[PDB]
C-alpha cells in the first residue's frame, strides 16, 4: 500500500473548506474531510473510488 495512505488527513494552512475524502486505513474506507484548499498531502482524494483505487490494497 503507499506509505501515504496510513497518514491522517491534513487540512492545511488555507481558509477554505472543500470536501475531499482520505483512506481510513483502519476502516478499509473511504471518509470525509474538509481541506483547505492548498498544499494537499497525496492522502487526498476528489473521490471514495479514488481513495479505494489508490490505497485499498493489493
Known sequence: RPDFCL???YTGPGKAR???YFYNAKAGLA???VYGGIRAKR???KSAED???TCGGA
Open 43 to 45: 492522502n487526498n482524494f
Open 31 to 33: 471518509q470525509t474531510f
Open 51 to 53: 481513495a479505494l483505487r
Open 18 to 20: 472543500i470536501i475531499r
Open 7 to 9: 497518514e491522517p488527513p
